[PDB]
Amino acid sequence: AEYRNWSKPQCGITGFAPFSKDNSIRLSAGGDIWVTREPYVSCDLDKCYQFALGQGTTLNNVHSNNTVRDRTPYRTLLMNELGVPFHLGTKQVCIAWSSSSCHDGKAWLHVCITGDDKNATASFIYNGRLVDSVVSWSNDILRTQESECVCINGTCTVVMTDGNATGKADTKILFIEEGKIVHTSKLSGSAQHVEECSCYPRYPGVRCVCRDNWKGSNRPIIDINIKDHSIVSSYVCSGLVGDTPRKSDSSSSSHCLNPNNEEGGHGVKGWAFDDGNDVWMGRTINETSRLGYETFKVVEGWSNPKSKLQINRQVIVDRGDRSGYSGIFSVEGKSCINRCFYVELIRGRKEETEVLWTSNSIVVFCGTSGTYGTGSWPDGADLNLMHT
Amino acid sequence: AEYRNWSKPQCGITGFAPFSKDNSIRLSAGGDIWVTREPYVSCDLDKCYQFALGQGTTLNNVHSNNTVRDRTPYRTLLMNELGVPFHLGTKQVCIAWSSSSCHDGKAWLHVCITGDDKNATASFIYNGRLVDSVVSWSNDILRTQESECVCINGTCTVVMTDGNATGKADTKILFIEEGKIVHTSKLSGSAQHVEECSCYPRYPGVRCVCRDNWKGSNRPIIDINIKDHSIVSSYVCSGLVGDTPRKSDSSSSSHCLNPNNEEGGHGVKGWAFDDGNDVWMGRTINETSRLGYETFKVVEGWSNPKSKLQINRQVIVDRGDRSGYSGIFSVEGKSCINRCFYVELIRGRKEETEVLWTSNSIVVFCGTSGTYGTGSWPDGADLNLMHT
Amino acid sequence: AEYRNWSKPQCGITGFAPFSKDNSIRLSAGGDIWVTREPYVSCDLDKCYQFALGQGTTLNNVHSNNTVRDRTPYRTLLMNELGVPFHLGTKQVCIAWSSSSCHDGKAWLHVCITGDDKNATASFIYNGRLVDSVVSWSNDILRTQESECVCINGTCTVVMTDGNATGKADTKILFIEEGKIVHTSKLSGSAQHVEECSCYPRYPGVRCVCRDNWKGSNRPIIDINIKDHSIVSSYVCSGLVGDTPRKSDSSSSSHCLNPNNEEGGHGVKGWAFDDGNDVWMGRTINETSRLGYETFKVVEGWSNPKSKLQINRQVIVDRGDRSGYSGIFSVEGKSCINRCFYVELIRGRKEETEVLWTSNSIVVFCGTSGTYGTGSWPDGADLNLMHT
Amino acid sequence: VQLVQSGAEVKRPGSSVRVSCKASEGTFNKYTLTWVRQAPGQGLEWMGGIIPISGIANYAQKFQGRVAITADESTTTAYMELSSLRSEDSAVYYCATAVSDYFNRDLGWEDYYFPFWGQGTLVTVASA
Amino acid sequence: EIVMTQSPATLSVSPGARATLFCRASRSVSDNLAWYQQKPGQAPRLLIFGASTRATGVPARFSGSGSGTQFTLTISSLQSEDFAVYYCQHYNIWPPWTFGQGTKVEIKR
Ligand SMILES: *[C@@H]1O[C@H](CO)[C@@H](O[C@@H]2O[C@H](CO)[C@@H](O[C@@H]3O[C@H](CO[C@H]4O[C@H](CO[C@H]5O[C@H](CO)[C@@H](O)[C@H](O)[C@@H]5O)[C@@H](O)[C@H](O[C@H]5O[C@H](CO)[C@@H](O)[C@H](O)[C@@H]5O)[C@@H]4O)[C@@H](O)[C@H](O[C@H]4O[C@H](CO)[C@@H](O)[C@H](O)[C@@H]4O[C@H]4O[C@H](CO)[C@@H](O)[C@H](O)[C@@H]4O)[C@@H]3O)[C@H](O)[C@H]2NC(C)=O)[C@H](O)[C@H]1NC(C)=O
Ligand SMILES: *[C@@H]1O[C@H](CO)[C@@H](O[C@@H]2O[C@H](CO)[C@@H](O[C@@H]3O[C@H](CO[C@H]4O[C@H](CO[C@H]5O[C@H](CO)[C@@H](O)[C@H](O)[C@@H]5O)[C@@H](O)[C@H](O[C@H]5O[C@H](CO)[C@@H](O)[C@H](O)[C@@H]5O)[C@@H]4O)[C@@H](O)[C@H](O[C@H]4O[C@H](CO)[C@@H](O)[C@H](O)[C@@H]4O[C@H]4O[C@H](CO)[C@@H](O)[C@H](O)[C@@H]4O)[C@@H]3O)[C@H](O)[C@H]2NC(C)=O)[C@H](O)[C@H]1NC(C)=O
Ligand SMILES: *[C@@H]1O[C@H](CO)[C@@H](O[C@@H]2O[C@H](CO)[C@@H](O[C@@H]3O[C@H](CO[C@H]4O[C@H](CO[C@H]5O[C@H](CO)[C@@H](O)[C@H](O)[C@@H]5O)[C@@H](O)[C@H](O[C@H]5O[C@H](CO)[C@@H](O)[C@H](O)[C@@H]5O)[C@@H]4O)[C@@H](O)[C@H](O[C@H]4O[C@H](CO)[C@@H](O)[C@H](O)[C@@H]4O[C@H]4O[C@H](CO)[C@@H](O)[C@H](O)[C@@H]4O)[C@@H]3O)[C@H](O)[C@H]2NC(C)=O)[C@H](O)[C@H]1NC(C)=O
Ligand SMILES: *[C@@H]1O[C@H](CO[C@@H]2O[C@@H](C)[C@@H](O)[C@@H](O)[C@@H]2O)[C@@H](O[C@@H]2O[C@H](CO)[C@@H](O[C@@H]3O[C@H](CO)[C@@H](O)[C@H](O)[C@@H]3O)[C@H](O)[C@H]2NC(C)=O)[C@H](O)[C@H]1NC(C)=O
Ligand SMILES: *[C@@H]1O[C@H](CO[C@@H]2O[C@@H](C)[C@@H](O)[C@@H](O)[C@@H]2O)[C@@H](O[C@@H]2O[C@H](CO)[C@@H](O[C@@H]3O[C@H](CO)[C@@H](O)[C@H](O)[C@@H]3O)[C@H](O)[C@H]2NC(C)=O)[C@H](O)[C@H]1NC(C)=O
Ligand SMILES: *[C@@H]1O[C@H](CO[C@@H]2O[C@@H](C)[C@@H](O)[C@@H](O)[C@@H]2O)[C@@H](O[C@@H]2O[C@H](CO)[C@@H](O[C@@H]3O[C@H](CO)[C@@H](O)[C@H](O)[C@@H]3O)[C@H](O)[C@H]2NC(C)=O)[C@H](O)[C@H]1NC(C)=O
Ligand SMILES: *[C@@H]1O[C@H](CO)[C@@H](O[C@@H]2O[C@H](CO)[C@@H](O[C@@H]3O[C@H](CO)[C@@H](O)[C@H](O)[C@@H]3O)[C@H](O)[C@H]2NC(C)=O)[C@H](O)[C@H]1NC(C)=O
Ligand SMILES: *[C@@H]1O[C@H](CO)[C@@H](O[C@@H]2O[C@H](CO)[C@@H](O[C@@H]3O[C@H](CO)[C@@H](O)[C@H](O)[C@@H]3O)[C@H](O)[C@H]2NC(C)=O)[C@H](O)[C@H]1NC(C)=O
Ligand SMILES: *[C@@H]1O[C@H](CO[C@@H]2O[C@@H](C)[C@@H](O)[C@@H](O)[C@@H]2O)[C@@H](O[C@@H]2O[C@H](CO)[C@@H](O)[C@H](O)[C@H]2NC(C)=O)[C@H](O)[C@H]1NC(C)=O
Ligand SMILES: *[C@@H]1O[C@H](CO[C@@H]2O[C@@H](C)[C@@H](O)[C@@H](O)[C@@H]2O)[C@@H](O[C@@H]2O[C@H](CO)[C@@H](O)[C@H](O)[C@H]2NC(C)=O)[C@H](O)[C@H]1NC(C)=O
Ligand SMILES: *[C@@H]1O[C@H](CO)[C@@H](O[C@@H]2O[C@H](CO)[C@@H](O)[C@H](O)[C@H]2NC(C)=O)[C@H](O)[C@H]1NC(C)=O
Ligand SMILES: [Ca+2]
Ligand SMILES: [Ca+2]
Ligand SMILES: [Ca+2]
Ligand SMILES: [Ca+2]
C-alpha cells in the first residue's frame, strides 16, 4: 500500500449522526471487562479502532479499587476494533500512562509514555516493533495527546509537552517517519499553554485544537506545516468557548491570539474544527463540571471573536449524565474527509461513591451531510446495582 | 471483487434441512452472553453472519432486568459469524434499536436506527464508515426490516417506515449505493400497513413479504424494481395466512389485493417466497400466540386466494415451545440461489416470569433439493433452574 | 487452489510422538468451557482443527446435568484450531448429534446428522453453505463416523449407517463433490456390522477401520475405490484384536473375513492402519472397560490371523485412567503422508458420580520416523475438587 | 509532625534569602512541603510546594522565576529561596505540610490544605 | 483565581456567647474548604477541612457547615482561647489555594 495523504476536501457537515457505542460499564457488571480511561478512536484504511489506557485490571477485580490515579507502571494502551468492548482477549499494544496512535497507510505508530513523573520515557512503536525513544526534556510529567496523531506522506506528527506545558520551553511537535523521530519543532506563536491536542489532517498541514489548563477557557490552535516543520499557534476565536470550566454563554468572551483569562485554570480535552469561517465544536453542557455533552456550529466563530450566533445544536449526552474527554478523528470517504468525534463517559470515583473504581465507556458520532434527529446516549450503567 | 447480482435461478426446493443453532440461552446460564432480540442472518461471498439487537448488557447481569423494552439508547447491532454465540468479544457494529444489513459483493452496509421515538435517526454505515443519514419523516418511530437488505449491482434496497403502528403509516423504499442514499420511492400499490419486510433477490428485482399490523392477517408483498426505482405491492394470495394472530385454517380467507380484515391488528415478522404459482412460507403453529413454528408449500397459493392445499409440512419448533420473529435470507450456490430462514426463539418476560430478562436464541434452516426427515429444535433453556 | 489427492507414500513410522492436549476438563473447573463428546481432529492445508459434538451447554452450568445422552436437539458440531479449548467464542458449524468433517484442499465439508431417531436428516454443508441433504433410509438412528471423512481429487467419502448397521441393507458409502451427493454404494464384502469408521487416504483409494457392535471384537475393514465407487470389506486379521470388550490376549483369536464371535457385542470407536504386512493399532489397555490406551505394531498382523507378535508398544494413557473413542487422521508432510491419532478422555457420569455431567478432553499423537521415549498423558482433572 | 525553621533575616533590596525547614524524618514521602507567607497585617498567601515521591515543585503564578523550593530527604530539610527581593517581600514565611500527595495531570490536586506549620521565619527587606 | 471573602471583618462577642463567621467563594469550591485559627505571634492552626470535618485536637465547640459558594464556621461558646483571627481557604481542584483576608473575633469591651 501507499502512505495516506488526506488530500481530499473536508466533507459538507450539517451535524453528526450516531456511529458507535461500547456499553463497557453495563457489560462490566456481568463479565470480565478492563478498567480504562482517556479513550480515543483512530482508523486504518478499512476499519476504526478504539484505544484506551488500561489500569492493568478488570473492573470486577480486587485491583480495580483506587483506579482514579492517572499514572502507574501497570497502565497499557489497549487496542480493539471499534465496538468490540475491552474484554480479556484485548491486546495491550505498549506500556503507557499517556499515549497517541495513528496509521500512516502502511502500519500503526503508537507513541507510548511511561516511567517516573520526574524522568518519563516515550517509546515510538511502529509496525509492532520499538523504533525510537526520547526522554522527558523538562523532567515534570512528559505527556501527549490522548488521541490520534496524524500522518501525511508517512510523516506522522505528535504534540508532546512537559513541565507546566508553557510555550516554546515545554511543548514540542515531533515529526516521525516509520517510528524514527526525524525532526522536532518547539511550539511557536501566541498559544501559551498547550495540552492534550485533538488533531486533524487539513492538507497540506495538520491542525490541532488543545487544552489550556492555566489561562484560557478558550482553546489553543496549532497549525503544523509537514513540509518545512514550521509551527504557528493562536486560540479558537468563538465567543462561545469550549473548555470546562468556563463562564456562562451570557458573560463569556474570547480572543483570537490570547487566552481569555475567564475561569482559565484547569480544563478538559476537547475539539473544534473550521468550516470556512464557521466552527464546529463540542463541549460539556455544564459550565463548571463534566456533565452532558453538546455540539454546535458557531456562525463566523472561527474568524470573529465576538460571535455567539450558534446553530445546529445537538445533545449527545443529556445535561444530567457524566461525560469526560472528547476528541476528533478523521475518516476518509469516497470523495471527502469526514470529521468524527468520541466522548469518554467517565463513571465511578471521585464523583460517584457507590463504587471503588473509576472507568469509562464511549459513544462515537460522525459528521453527516444528511439529516438527523435527537437523542441522548449516556453511559447507562446503574452503579446502585453493581454497588460495592 | 465485483458487486453481487444474484442472476442465478432459484434452486429447486423440496423443504428445509437443519443448518445452524446458537443455543444462546442455555450457554447464558454459565457464560457471559449478550441479551438480544430481533435477530437475523445475512451472508457475504464466503460465510454467513448472525446479527441481533443487543440490549447493552449480558444476561447474567444487573442490567438484564426490564430488557422487554423495545427501544433504549444502549441497543447496538451485534455481528458474529453464524453459530458463534454472542459472547463478550462480539463486535457492536453500530448504535441501533432497529436495523438491517447486507453485503453488496464488496462490503457490508448496515442501516442503523436510533434516537427519540418521535425524532429518530437512520445511519447508513458502509465499509466500516458512516456515509449517510436520514431523519424520521413522520415523527413516530422510524423503523426498518430487522432482516437483511438486498443488493443488485451495488444498489442496495431497504424498506423503512414511520408513523402509526395501527393506522396509515408512511413507508419508503431507499436505494443506496456504497452507503449513499441515491433514491427514495414512496410505497405504491394496494398494501395498507407494511412493516418488518423479509426481502429476497428475485433478479432483476427484489421481492419482500412483510407484516401488516393493522388490517391483514395475510402478509403484504412489495416488488421493487432496482433499475427504475418503481414500487408495486399486494398481499400473499393463499387462503392459509402467515401472520399471527390469524383465524383457524378451516375459517380463514385471503385476498390478492386487500388486507383480509380477519384479526388484522398486530402481527409477527415472517416470510414467504414464490415457487412458480406455489408459495413456500413459515408461520407460528399457534394462531393467537408465538408458539411453535411450521413451514409448508401451498399449491397455487401464490396466485389462487381460495387455495388451502398444503403439502411438505415441517415442524421446526414444536407447538408447545416459544417462537418469535422469522425471516428469509438468500445464499448463492454453484448453480442457483437458495432460500434459507431463521427463527427467533424468544424466552423470558412478559410470558415467562421465572426470569427478569427477555432474550432469544436462534435456529436456522436452509432450502434443500434433497430429502429430509423430522425433528423439533426449540430453545431448550430451563428457566426454572436459571430462576431469579 | 487445487483439490487434495494424498498421492504420496505413507511415512515410515517407528511409533508416535506427543502432538497436542486440550486440558478441557481442568480448564472447565475455572472458566466457561463447552460440554462435549465424540471428538475428532482433521487438518486443512495449513492447520489442524479439533471438532466435537457439544451438548449445547458449558460445563459449569445448570444445563450440564444429564449430558450422558448421545442424541438431543441441542447438539452442535464445535470447531476450533487444535489446542484452542472449546471456550464460548467457539464456532458451532452445524446442528449435529452425529458428524464427520474433512477439507478437500479448497473448503470444509461437514456431514451433520440431527432429528428424530426414527427419521433423522443428514445435512451436507460445504464452503459454509448447505448444499445437500438425505433422510434416514432405514428409520433407526442414521449415524456417521464421528471422525474425519477423506477426499481425493475433490470426491469426499463418508461411511453412514442406519438400523443395526447390517451389511448392504444398512451401511452405505456416500461419494460427495463440493457438498453434492454424487453417488451412493451399499456396503459389499464380508464385514457384517460396520459403525463409526476411522478412515484414511491410501491412494488411489480410501481405507477405513470400523466398530463391530454385534459379532466382532476384531475390527471391520472397508476399502473404498474413489474412481469406480466399488466397495470391498473384511476384518483386521491380527490375533491381538482392537475392540472393547474383547478376550484377554492369551485367549483371543481373529479371522480375516469374519467377526471372531469373542465378546462380539458392544464396542468402541478405534483405528488401525497397515504397514506392509504389519499393522499399527491402538486400543484400551483394559479388556472390558474404556481404561488406559496403548498402541503397538503387530508383526504380519494385517495379513496373518494367528500372529500375536507385538513390538513398539507405547502407553498413551495409563491403565488406571479413563479413555474413550479414538480415531486416525492423516497429515501431509514434505515427502510422505503421516498418520496421527487422537484419544477422547471421557470424564464424569455414569462411571464417576462425583459430578452431574459427562464430558471429554483429548490428547493427540502423530507418527514419527524418529525416536521417542515414554509417558502417560491422562485427562488430569480432579473431580473430587470440582465435586457437585 | 514537627517543622523547625531558620531564625529571622534582614536583607538588602534586590538580593536573595534562603529560609530552611527541618521536618520529622520521612515527612517528604507523606506530605507536600509548602511555603506560605504573611505580610505583617495583610493576609496569607501560598507561594508553592514540593510534592512527595517525585519531588517536582509547583509555584503560584506571581513568584515564577523568583522562587525555588527544594528538599533534601537525607537531613529531611526543605529550603525556599526567594530572589530579586522587593521591599514588599517583607513578611513572615511559614513552611507547612499539605495533605495533597499526588498531582493527577487531568484532575489536579486533592486535599491541598495545611495540617502542620513551622514556627515562621520573619524576613525584612530594608536598606538600614 | 477563586476569590475568598469573609464577613464581618471584625466580630465583637461576649465571652461564653456563640459566634458565626461567614466565608463566601467567588465560584463553587464544592466542600474543598478549610478554616484556620491564628492567635497573635503564632503560626496558623487548621480547625476544619472538607467544610465540616474537625481537625485533630479541635474541641467540639467548633463546627463548620456549607457547600458550593457559602460556608459558616460556628464557635458554640467563646472561651478566652477562641479570641483569634480566623481564615477560610479553598483547596478546590486547581491553584492558587487562596485564603480569605480573615475575620478577627474580639472581646466585647
Ligand atoms: C428533531 O431533530 C432535529 C435535529 O436535532 C431538531 O432540530 C434542531 O433543533 C435545534 C433547537 O435547539 C436547532 O439548534 C438551535 O438553533 C437556533 C438557531 O436557529 C434558529 O435561528 C436562526 C437565525 O434566526 C434569526 O435570524 C433570522 C434571519 O436569518 C430571523 O428570521 C429570525 O427571526 C432570527 O432573528 C434560523 O436561521 C434558524 O432557522 C432554520 O432552522 C429551523 C429549525 O431549527 C427551521 O425551522 C428554519 O426553517 C430554518 O431552516 C432557526 O430559526 C439556536 O437559537 C439554538 O441555540 C440556542 O438554544 C439552545 C437550546 O435549544 C441553547 O442551549 C443555546 O445556548 C442557544 O440559546 C441562546 O441563544 C438564543 C438566541 O440565539 C436565545 O433564544 C436563548 O435564550 C439563549 O440566549 C440552537 O443552536 C437546530 O438548528 C435544529 N437542527 C436542524 C438541523 O434543524 C428538531 O428540533 C427535532 N424535532 C423534534 C420533533 O424533536
Ligand atoms: C419423516 O420425514 C418426512 C419429511 O419431513 C415426512 O414426510 C412428510 O410428511 C408430512 C405428513 O404430514 C407431509 O405433509 C403433509 O402433506 C399432506 C398432503 O400430502 C398428502 O396428500 C396429497 C393429496 O392427496 C390427494 O390428491 C392426490 C392427487 O394430488 C391423490 O392421489 C390422493 O388420492 C388424494 O386425493 C398426496 O399427494 C400426498 O402423497 C405424497 O406424499 C406421501 C407422504 O406424505 C407419499 O406416501 C405419497 O407417495 C406421495 O408422494 C400425501 O398423501 C397435507 O395434507 C398435510 O397438511 C395437513 O396435515 C397437517 C399436519 O401434518 C395439518 O396441520 C394441516 O392443516 C393439514 O391438515 C388439514 O387437511 C387435511 C386434509 O387435507 C385434514 O385431514 C386435516 O384435518 C386438516 O383439515 C401436510 O402438509 C409431507 O408432505 C411429507 N414430506 C415429504 C418430503 O415426504 C415423514 O412423514 C416422516 N416420517 C416419519 C416416520 O416420521
Ligand atoms: C524409553 O522409551 C522407549 C520407547 O518408548 C522404550 O522402548 C520400547 O519399550 C517397549 C517395552 O515394552 C517395547 O515394546 C515391546 O516389544 C516387545 C518385543 O520386542 C523385544 O523382542 C523382539 C523379538 O525378540 C525375539 O526374537 C529375537 C530375534 O529376532 C530373539 O533374539 C529374542 O530372544 C526373541 O525370541 C526383539 O526384536 C526386540 O529387540 C529390539 O528392541 C530391544 C529394546 O526393547 C533392543 O535391545 C534390541 O537391540 C532390538 O532393537 C525386543 O527385545 C514385546 O514383547 C512387548 O510386548 C509385551 O510386553 C508388554 C508390556 O511391556 C505387554 O503388555 C504385552 O502384552 C507383551 O507381553 C506379552 O508378550 C511377551 C512376548 O512378546 C511375553 O513375554 C509376555 O509374557 C506377554 O505374553 C512390547 O511390545 C518397544 O519395542 C520399545 N521401543 C523402542 C523403539 O525401543 C524404552 O523401554 C523406554 N525406557 C525407559 C527406561 O523408560
Ligand atoms: C505529499 O506527497 C506528494 C507526493 O510527493 C512524492 O512523495 C513524497 C512522500 C515525497 O517523497 C516527495 O518528494 C515526492 O515528490 C506531494 O505531491 C507532489 O508534490 C510535488 C511538489 O509540489 C510535485 O512535484 C513536481 O512534479 C512535477 C511533475 O509532475 C515535476 O516536474 C516538478 O519538478 C516537481 O517534482 C508533484 O507533482 C506532486 N504530486 C502529486 C500527485 O500531487 C505532496 O506535495 C506531499 N504533501 C505534503 C504535505 O507532504
Ligand atoms: C446488473 O448489471 C449488469 C451489468 O451492468 C454493468 O455493471 C453493473 C455492476 C453496473 O455498474 C451497471 O451500471 C453496468 O452497466 C447488467 O447487464 C448488462 O445489461 C446491458 C444492457 O442491456 C448489456 O449491454 C449490452 O451489451 C452488449 C455487449 O455485451 C452490447 O452490444 C449492447 O449494445 C449493450 O450495451 C450488458 O451486456 C449486460 N451484461 C450482462 C453481463 O448481462 C444488468 O442488466 C444489471 N441488472 C440490474 C437488475 O441492475
Ligand atoms: C486424481 O486426479 C489426477 C488428475 O485427474 C484430473 O484432475 C482432477 C483434479 C480431477 O478433475 C479429475 O477428474 C481429472 O481427471 C489423476 O491423474 C491422471 O490420471 C489419468 C488417468 O490415469 C492420466 O491420463 C493419462 O495421461 C497420459 C499423458 O499424460 C495419456 O497418454 C493417457 O492416454 C491418459 O490420458 C493423467 O496423466 C494423470 N495425471 C497425473 C498428473 O498423474 C488421478 O488418476 C486421480 N486419482 C484418483 C484416485 O482419482
Ligand atoms: C494522494 O494519494 C492518492 C492515492 O491514495 C493519490 O490519488 C491517486 O493518484 C495516482 C496518480 O495520479 C493515480 O494512479 C494512476 O491511476 C490511473 C488510473 O487507474 C492509472 O492508469 C495510472 O497508471 C496510475 O496508477 C490513482 O488512481 C489515484 N487514486 C485515487 C483514489 O484517486 C493522490 O494523487 C495523492 N495526492 C497528493 C496531493 O498527495
Ligand atoms: C497430486 O497433487 C499435486 C499438487 O498438490 C501434484 O503435484 C504437482 O503436479 C504438477 C503437474 O505435474 C506440477 O506442475 C509442474 O511443475 C513444474 C515445476 O514447478 C512447472 O515448471 C510446470 O510448468 C508445472 O506447473 C507440480 O510441480 C507438482 N507439485 C508438487 C508439489 O509436486 C501431483 O502430481 C498430483 N498427483 C496426481 C497423481 O495427479
Ligand atoms: C393510530 O391510529 C388509530 C386508528 O384511528 C385512525 O387514526 C386517527 C388519528 C383518526 O384519523 C381516525 O379517524 C382513524 O380511524 C387511532 O385510534 C383512535 O384513537 C382515539 C383516541 O386516541 C379514539 O378516539 C378513536 O376512536 C380511535 N379510532 C380507532 C378506529 O381505533 C390512534 O389514536 C392513532 N394513534 C396515534 C398515536 O396517532
Ligand atoms: C510555567 O513554568 C514556566 C517555566 O518556568 C521554570 O519552571 C517553573 C516550574 C519554575 O521553576 C520557574 O521558576 C522556572 O523559570 C514559567 O516560565 C517562567 O516564568 C517567568 C515569569 O514568571 C519567566 O521570567 C521565566 O523566564 C520563565 N522560565 C522559562 C525557563 O522560560 C511560567 O511562569 C509557568 N506558568 C504557568 C502558567 O504556570
Ligand atoms: C395457543 O397459545 C395460547 C397461549 O399460550 C394457549 O392458551 C392457553 O390455553 C390454556 C387451556 O388450553 C389455558 O389454561 C391458558 O390460560 C391459556 N393461556 C393464555 C396466556 O391465555 C392456547 O391453548 C394455544 N392454542 C392452541 C390451539 O395451541
Ligand atoms: Ca482552562
Ligand atoms: Ca396482522
Ligand atoms: Ca465467571
Ligand atoms: Ca464388538
Author numbering:
A (entry chain I), B (entry chain J), C (entry chain G): 82 to 469
D (entry chain C): 2 to 129
E (entry chain N): 1 to 109
Question: What do the authors of the reporting publication say about this deposited model?
Answer:
Three mAbs—FNI9, FNI17 and FNI19—stood out for their binding to a broad panel of cell-surface-displayed seasonal and animal circulating IAV and IBV NAs. Owing to the functional constraints associated with the SA receptor interactions, the key contact residues of the FNI mAbs are highly conserved across IAV and IBV NAs.
Since the 2014/2015 Northern Hemisphere influenza season, a new N-linked glycosylation site at position 245 was introduced on the N2 NA as a result of the S245N and S247T substitutions. Two-dimensional classification of the cryo-electron microscopy data showed the presence of N2 tetramers carrying the N245 glycan saturated with three or four FNI9 Fabs (6.08% with three FNI9 Fabs and 91.20% with four FNI9 Fabs) or FNI19 Fabs (6.05% with three FNI19 Fabs and 93.27% with four FNI19 Fabs), whereas only zero or one FNI17 Fabs (77.03% with zero FNI17 Fabs and 22.97% with one FNI17 Fab) were found to occupy each tetramer. Despite the N245 glycan being associated with decreased binding to N2, FNI9 and FNI19 retained nanomolar binding affinity. Overall, FNI9 and FNI19 mAbs were found to be the most active to contemporary H3N2 strains carrying the N245 glycosylation as well as to oseltamivir-resistant strains. The energy required for the induced fit of loop 242/252 could underlie the differences in affinity and neutralizing activity of the FNI mAbs against the recent N2 NAs.
